[PDB]
Design a protein around this ligand. Structure first.
Ligand SMILES: [Mg+2]
Ligand SMILES: [Mg+2]
Ligand SMILES: [Mg+2]
Ligand SMILES: [Mg+2]
Ligand SMILES: [Mg+2]
Ligand SMILES: [Mg+2]
Ligand SMILES: [Mg+2]
Ligand SMILES: [Mg+2]
Ligand SMILES: [Mg+2]
Ligand SMILES: [Mg+2]
Ligand SMILES: [Mg+2]
Ligand SMILES: [Mg+2]
Ligand SMILES: [Mg+2]
Ligand SMILES: [Mg+2]
Ligand SMILES: [Mg+2]
Ligand SMILES: [Mg+2]
Ligand SMILES: [Mg+2]
Ligand SMILES: [Mg+2]
Ligand SMILES: [Zn+2]
Lengths: 82, 66, 177, 115
RNA sequence: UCCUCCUAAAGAGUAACGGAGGAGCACGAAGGUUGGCUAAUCCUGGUCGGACAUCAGGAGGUUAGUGCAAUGGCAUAAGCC
RNA sequence: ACGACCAGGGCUACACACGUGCUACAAUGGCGCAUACAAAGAGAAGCGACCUCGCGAGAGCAAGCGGACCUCAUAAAGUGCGUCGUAGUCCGGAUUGGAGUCUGCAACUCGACUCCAUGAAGUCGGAAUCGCUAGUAAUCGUGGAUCAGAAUGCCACGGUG
């Protein structure tokens, strides 16, 4: 975890983009190459698409996810089984 | 009821620590207490306690703000 | 006899009101309490039969029935006439003095107790229920159980439907849900 | 002896004996016996009875056997049923906190197991 | 050599290298009598209990059983204590 | 383009096998209290004592030092008094959940650390094999290099012997 007294992390290029994209409403999936942001409560109910290493993977974000960071719904290396 | 082959049956006190004095016949012999009394038991006042879900907005805005 | 002193005087005063009845016969009545604690594992020792014929006898004061297997199954190592089951039946006032020890003491005593679910009436109001362990009837010494094996209380009553037989037990605040 | 859900052995001391509950170790086990006015080398036997009558009051203000197991196995199922990375490392049966699994993941992977 | 149904033509009987099956024992009760009781099977509920152990009603009514082959019997049971 | 800049992944995946090490399987030992004796190093974007807040990692304030001056720094094994009584154990700490601290643009894949829970596997280890001839093997702690944070290995010095 972070130190608390610095506050949570989020990029500016996703914070300003998400405050624009709430107030323009469109569920065209917002893509991002920034998989290290703490998801904020006013990001509840959005379809973003985080990079995983190859392409974006879409993530529809609910109330339950808002503690975590955007990486933990993009599993990185593929695995099927030997 | 056959007269012999069934065991003993005598009245014994079964009090609880919350104050439910009672008498019941059994074969236990000794005075037997009680821990849990269903006249104040946590089933009608104490099974809310587990749910512990919480809004994630609440776990967010309990520790800091913006 | 205490719950039956409660019953005939202060249950009909609700079960005559809420269900539009003419006589005192139309209300359901309890019939019998049966206690099956079957030992399906007594082929390796006869002691596991007779101890399971004593460990529920010490709960409610009757010597029980060593009931036998009815027909034959090749799979579970049974034939006609293997004593595998143990049964107690209670009627009348001993039914009430056991129902007291169930619903006053042995119902909250069970580990992780969170009520007993609202559908066990087999469509005719005749109840069924099942404990998982014996010491929750508090009439046993602690370290004097050879194994742990539950029984199943079955309250056969003169209930007629699932809607109309449940309220009898719920009049004794049966911890449903 | 019968304290807070399940029994407690009597021959052991108070501090080592109270750890038989699910959810007390050697910190809450001295919190109880210093917020209820008991010593620490008297047994469950040769106590009095009112000491248990207030020890049972002290213990049940925490979360104990029912509540702990339901909360822990609630949070595990919650972490499973989103897609979280701890969720996938739960529902594959592999170590979660970033262990090396080229060898030595055996505590999650059970036994040593040929093909 | 003996036993059961069919061919056998509505009574008995009626054959072939014709069509199918069982016996050459058991039981000190599995016998006499008195008293009492009633099934196979599936649905539903239930401690480990599963499609099939035991327990509860409940449908249904010999579709079950006879120490063994079939055939004929069998509730007054000749079935089961 | 086999050149060059940038964000995000990757070397850390795992059905398995081998090699090297650490911690144990306990009484010559766990835990709690008091009590003595070392050596060799390092430090200015650094080492950071005293004092206060915190259960604890540590944030708060600000002296001291280019150092036989000041710091890091308390040695641990031991000795004395308790407790423990052969148990998967007050043995062992694996794995998992909840809450936190610090360096750092940033600890999700992947950081160390402290508290509250959880308490697996293991009762001296098969064939075969490894090191050592005196301050040696066996156990005990401390420092350094690389380093914003991050070694149970590496390189050093002593304590019992
Ligand atoms: Mg605990
Ligand atoms: Mg602990
Ligand atoms: Mg004829
Ligand atoms: Mg016969
Ligand atoms: Mg069924
Ligand atoms: Mg007869
Ligand atoms: Mg790069
Ligand atoms: Mg590598
Ligand atoms: Mg190996
Ligand atoms: Mg000690
Ligand atoms: Mg340094
Ligand atoms: Mg302080
Ligand atoms: Mg320990
Ligand atoms: Mg802990
Ligand atoms: Mg073992
Ligand atoms: Mg031993
Ligand atoms: Mg370093
Ligand atoms: Mg040395
Ligand atoms: Zn109480």
């Amino acid at each position: 975890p972070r130190s608390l007294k610095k506050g949570p992390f989020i990029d500016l290029h996703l914070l300003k983009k998400v405050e624009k994209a709430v107030e323009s409403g469109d569920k065209k999936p917002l893509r991002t190459w920034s998989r290290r942001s703490t998801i904020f409560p006013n990001m509840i109910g959005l379809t973003i698409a985080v990079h995983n290493g190859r392409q974006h993977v879409p993530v529809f974000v609910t109330d339950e996810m808002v503690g975590h960071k955007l990486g933990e719904f993009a599993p990185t290396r593929t695995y099927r089984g030997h | 009821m056959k007269k012999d082959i069934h065991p003993k049956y005598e009245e014994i006190t079964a009090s609880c620590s919350c104050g439910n004095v009672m008498k019941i016949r059994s074969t236990v012999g000794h005075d037997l207490n009680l821990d849990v009394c269903s006249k104040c038991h946590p089933f009608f006042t104490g099974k809310q306690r587990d749910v512990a879900t919480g809004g994630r907005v609440d776990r967010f805005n309990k520790r800091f703000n913006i | 006899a205490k719950l039956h002193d409660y019953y005939k005087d202060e249950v009909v005063k609700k079960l005559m009101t809420e269900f539009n009845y003419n006589s005192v016969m139309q209300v359901p009545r309890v019939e019998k309490i049966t206690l099956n604690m079957g030992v399906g594992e007594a082929i390796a020792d006869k002691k596991l039969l007779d101890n399971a014929a004593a460990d529920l006898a010490a709960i409610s004061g009757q010597k029980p029935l060593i009931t036998k297997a009815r027909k034959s199954v090749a799979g579970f190592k049974i034939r006609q006439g293997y004593p595998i089951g143990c049964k107690v039946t209670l009627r009348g006032e001993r039914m009430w003095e056991f129902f007291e020890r169930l619903i006053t003491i042995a119902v909250p005593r069970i580990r992780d107790f969170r009520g007993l679910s609202a559908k066990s009436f087999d469509g005719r109001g005749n109840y069924s229920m099942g404990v998982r362990e014996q010491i929750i009837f508090p009439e046993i010494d602690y370290d004097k159980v050879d194994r742990v094996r539950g029984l199943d209380i079955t309250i056969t009553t003169t209930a007629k439907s699932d809607e109309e037989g449940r309220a009898l037990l719920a009049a004794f605040d049966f911890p449903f849900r | 002896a019968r304290i807070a859900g399940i029994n407690i052995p009597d021959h052991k001391h108070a501090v080592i004996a109270l750890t038989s509950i699910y959810g007390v170790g050697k910190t809450r086990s001295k919190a109880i016996l210093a917020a209820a006015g008991i010593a620490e080398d008297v047994k469950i036997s040769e106590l009095s009875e009112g000491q248990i009558d207030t020890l049972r009051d002290e213990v049940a203000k925490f979360v104990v056997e029912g509540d702990l197991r339901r909360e822990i196995s609630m949070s595990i199922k919650r972490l499973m049923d989103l897609g979280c990375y701890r969720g996938l490392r739960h529902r594959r049966g592999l170590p979660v906190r970033g262990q090396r699994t080229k060898t030595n993941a055996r505590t999650r992977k059970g036994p040593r197991k040929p093909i």
